[PDB]
């Protein structure tokens, strides 16, 4: 790697994601997740960037950001689940990244479904269905859709 492969890859990839319409290509998700998971030395910066990336951008990017938050979130969750407070010090990092998404996931989901059509809705329903199917998540931690109405009532 070189000095040209710094946070520039994450930003430039998310920017190229915003520059395009339709399609949620996994390559851009791979670059984002790659630079995040490469060393985990940045949490609130990466998280503020993807959340606000969804915030400032159209519908395709609400869905796209849900898939980005999904990959980095699940990867963070497994990586910090593999760790323990008896083998780590100084709170922060991916643990706090998930904790920070935990304050916006409610509006990210509820808007991403309300902005969606039957197809994108069903995709968001499938995303949360896979979260529940994986057993990596539990009840009272997914109410984010402002209760089942959104994609779960139909």
């Amino acid at each position: 790697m070189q000095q040209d492969d710094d946070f520039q890859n994450f930003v430039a990839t998310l920017e190229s994601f915003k520059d395009l319409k339709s399609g949620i290509s996994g390559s851009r998700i791979k670059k984002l997740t790659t630079y995040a998971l490469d060393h985990i030395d940045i949490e609130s910066k990466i998280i503020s960037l993807i959340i606000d990336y969804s915030r400032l951008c159209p519908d395709s990017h609400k869905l796209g950001s849900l898939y980005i938050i999904d990959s980095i979130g699940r990867a963070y969750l497994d990586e910090t689940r593999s760790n323990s407070n008896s083998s780590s010090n100084k709170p922060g990092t991916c643990a706090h990244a998930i904790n920070t998404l935990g304050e916006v996931i409610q509006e990210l989901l509820s808007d991403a479904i309300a902005k969606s059509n039957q197809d994108h809705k069903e995709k968001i329903r499938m995303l949360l269905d896979i979260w529940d199917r994986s057993g990596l998540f539990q009840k009272s931690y997914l109410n984010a859709i402002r209760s089942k109405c959104f994609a779960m009532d139909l």
Binding site: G23, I24, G26, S27, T33, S71, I72, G73, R74, I130
Partner: peptide
């Protein structure tokens, strides 16, 4: 081909 490149789903982040 598909609308994604490479293909990706909530099944696995990696």
């Amino acid at each position: 081909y598909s609308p994604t490149s490479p293909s990706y789903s909530p099944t696995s982040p990696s």
